[PDB]
UniProtKB/Swiss-Prot annotation, chains A, B, C:
CDD domains referenced in this protein's UniProt entry, alphabetically: ASKHA_NBD_actin
Gene3D superfamilies, alphabetized: 3.30.420.40, Actin, Chain A, domain 4 (3.90.640.10)
Free-text description of this protein's post-translational modifications in UniProt: Oxidation of Met-40 and Met-43 by MICALs (MICAL1, MICAL2 or MICAL3) to form methionine sulfoxide promotes actin filament depolymerization. MICAL1 and MICAL2 produce the (R)-S-oxide form. The (R)-S-oxide form is reverted by MSRB1 and MSRB2, which promotes actin repolymerization. Can be mono-ADP-ribosylated on Arg-173 by SpvB of Salmonella spp. This modification blocks subsequent polymerization and leads to cell death.
Modified residues (Tele-methylhistidine): H69
Organism: Oryctolagus cuniculus (Rabbit)
Record-stated family: Belongs to the actin family.
Segments of this protein annotated with the region Interaction with alpha-actinin: 106-119, 354-366
Cross-referenced SUPFAM superfamilies: Actin-like ATPase domain
Residues with the Methionine (R)-sulfoxide modification: M40, M43
Alphabetized Pfam families for the sequence: Actin (PF00022)
InterPro entries per the UniProt record, alphabetical: Actin (IPR004000), Actin/actin-like_CS (IPR020902), Actin_CS (IPR004001), ATPase_NBD (IPR043129)
UniProt lineage: Eukaryota, Metazoa, Chordata, Craniata, Vertebrata
Name of the molecule in the record: Actin, alpha skeletal muscle
Length: 371, 371, 371
């Protein structure tokens, strides 16, 4: 009695069979529709494109994401994707295989409830389970207890976990991502003496961030040194036809995660927030949580972020603690992997949700059953 | 239920039966009337000559074209031609056979409407359809999707096409032809040191263009080399009784299509215009459109034009594209052939226009039904 | 110590003396060059015409605008214009009078820097200042705080302002203008049953928009009523020799500004964009900004646009706001007037930019000094 794992990401969709250790089918979750009327005339009496079919036609077409992190607002597009995943990608029948679905942290009551109903009434699967993306990531690292920061191509969250059990009532959402960082990056460049007011320049700033941004061991020490000298300056030539320069900007951009005050947020930096989440956690797992801090997703990929996290937590630490930061090599696909191992374990078998249980208790049962 | 195909060209008329792969009746569409009164006195109490009858009497008589590309202004002459085509040429009854008619791009509302009315009220055909000359050409090459440049003996147009569907709202008209090129050709010859001010000389320049003009791989490279040296010079003796010489002129004449700035036009060269038309096209057909560029008609016959087109498009191309230029051997009769294959296909059967549909919606229905 | 005000528009140039309340010298900024070679032969061994000299010769000559809104790409032509303005128009010496220059929103770093350098090194003026066209318009209405929509004969922008201070980092550019609207207008006419495929017809559509287009109190209500009935239909006879008709088209054309979705733009309507700009603004000026919304320029002239703006903003408003729309009678020349009043005020005297300040800080200093 194996199950299918469908991971709904913030930019990519991962599908596979239970007991498999690597995804064999990955594709973005996008809907292709014409940008404007001129595109529509040449469409050829057809509506839209779904899946890999629209992937190579992306520039011309408007791509809409069924998932906003976050929250699924377009149900009609989302349905097409699941169909495409099970049929065109997986090439298996949903009725003969159970389905494992992922959910965004703090998922709305209407949104979580509608999805489960579709799986049984529409697809008519024998049994399906819904799990948290952050929870899955911890399993992949092989750690049952820990805290995982999940940043994908949409949203970033801090979720504490014990022996596979999470605390949804204690999950905080971070709205700070690379795009926000880029606007800050432009602000710092302007102070330096480089003007990036035009739209073309802003795109260039984005490229600069992606390839020329890293984080230093001590921000206050490094920022002042970079601000008063040209020792850390770098220059990059883009294929478009012009040359731009970046200096203190390279480490200042990622800094805002640690110090939100630079962008203008009421909430305190990520390093303190991680601390608050662990403090609110179970008494015998805190020791494990500090030594099991794991970051997941493409956005948090920036090298040295783990080292930078280590620097602030140790300096700002109280007294009865030790700080170690973990950054697994497979962190990009950590979320999918945890579900796979979890589904292959005996302990998780009792935690599955069936059709009969669903009808009587509703999708709400997820808070009581799902950790 | 077969149909007759009547192709109304910018100099030749092609007629035949549906399912036939080659025209068996071709003749120019001309009206013969006396040039002056002296011709009129010897006429023999008669008005004018229509069809093949006036073809061998062309020098003496004024030939008027019912079609200006373009736009049909003389209805009375045009009617005679259709009659001649169906009766004297085809030798079939219009009432027993459906008729397929062609139309010029951006055909005026009054002109398109009057023609269809004549076909049903006058000829009383069971059903008739009107198609675009450019659209037909693409079918002949066996390509359902592509972009075709149509240059005949009257006008040149760029029309994008997908699965047989065209975009009339996005069609641009080119007024640059060989005759315009010839005037330019005279201008360049004058700079060189050859004087062609007299009328007889101008005719000679025309002959020179027709037999001694070709296009080089790189215009800027070649023009400077030709201008500063006699290495590319050629001389031709006309049967009339005099000898003339052409050099850099041979490749400069066709160049204006690529670079309209030489003649004095606001609009940019043809290579850029083709690009603009494809960009405005449907998202999944653009990849096909670049690899399916097809040129049709006698004017664009000049060898090396396809090679020259290839050179500029690749050099001026952005980044996410590949450039291939197609020049089919049967391009002279490509327009007629596409209609023939199209009429023999099941998919096109649903796209035919009938008498009842016509009366309620009018000739306008053509934009909604005809691609 | 008075100054000269040179307003560089998107079609007209306004010049005058500081302390004057009305422009006494206005002329389009155009360069006259031959359309083609035939014009060139009759030129008379001369290059081009600048200023009022080329104004009555406009049909024959190609007119090039030094300013693209927007962005100045042709420096050589632009220089001639300033010379003509100060000398032939103004009839004053640039060296004895300070010069006030205007700039397009989001002006490129190279373009803004080159202009200021020319004013001091070339003209050698005692002192010159550069101001934003949108910022100037607010002063003319007599309001120091507000938000101004600037649409001329080139580009449309939304710029928030407080006590004379603007926010260039928060300025969004609108590419929607009457010409774009006209293409839409043709699309709606086609649906109705009127065919405007030919080029001559398109010009007619333009005339129709200019004289027969207005905006109704409720678009959704009115569009459906107009679509299903002939009650709002109008007909116009052009002097050329033909008669055309317009109905629902009259209010649908201006609508696209409110609802960009009709043309095919990712961005949301202007009414929402104005809201976003104010929200991002200073805390004590928002109350003033909503009650001080001012529109400037010829394109936004269409009567009822202010009334239409009022309808959507009130309906889509959250809770803690009141909506009032202001449309000053002198809005056509509002941009020039604000500079005039601003130059005559004591508060602005400290905000002027001098030669010594310029050389050390560069043209960039404009973001720090100019609001």
């Amino acid at each position: 009695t194996t199950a299918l794992v469908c991971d709904n990401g913030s930019g990519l969709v991962k599908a596979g069979f239970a007991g498999d250790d690597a995804p064999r089918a990955v594709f973005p979750s996008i809907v292709g529709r014409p940008r404007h009327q001129g595109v529509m005339v040449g469409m050829g009496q057809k509506d839209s494109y779904v899946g890999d079919e629209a992937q190579s036609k992306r520039g011309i077409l408007t791509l809409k994401y069924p998932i906003e992190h976050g929250i699924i607002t377009n149900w009609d597009d989302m349905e097409k994707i699941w169909h495409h995943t099970f049929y065109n990608e997986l090439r298996v029948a949903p009725e003969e295989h159970p389905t494992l679905l992922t959910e965004a942290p703090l998922n709305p009551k209407a949104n979580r409830e509608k999805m489960t109903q579709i799986m049984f009434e529409t697809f008519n699967v024998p049994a399906m389970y819904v799990a948290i993306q952050a929870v899955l990531s911890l399993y992949a690292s092989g750690r049952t207890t820990g805290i995982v920061l999940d940043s994908g191509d949409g949203v970033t969250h801090n979720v504490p976990i014990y022996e596979g059990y999470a605390l949804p009532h204690a999950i905080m959402r971070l709205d700070l991502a690379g795009r926000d960082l880029t606007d800050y990056l432009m602000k710092i460049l302007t102070e330096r003496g480089y003007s990036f007011v035009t739209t073309a320049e802003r795109e260039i700033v984005r490229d600069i961030k992606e390839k020329l941004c890293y984080v230093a061991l001590d921000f206050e020490n490094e920022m002042a040194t970079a601000a008063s000298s040209s020792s850390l300056e770098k220059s990059y030539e883009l294929p478009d036809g012009q040359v731009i320069t970046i200096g203190n900007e390279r480490f200042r951009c990622p800094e805002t995660l640690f110090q939100p005050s630079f962008i203008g947020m009421e909430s305190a930096g990520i390093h303190e927030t991680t601390y608050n989440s662990i403090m609110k956690c179970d008494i015998d797992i805190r020791k494990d949580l500090y030594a099991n801090n794991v970051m997941s997703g493409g956005t948090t990929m920036y090298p040295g972020i783990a080292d930078r996290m280590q620097k602030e937590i140790t300096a700002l630490a109280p007294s009865t603690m030790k700080i170690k930061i973990i950054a697994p090599p497979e962190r990009k696909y950590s979320v999918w992997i945890g579900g796979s191992i979890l589904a292959s374990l005996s302990t998780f078998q009792q935690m599955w949700i069936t059709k009969q249980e669903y009808d009587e208790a509703g999708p709400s049962i997820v808070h009581r059953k799902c950790f």
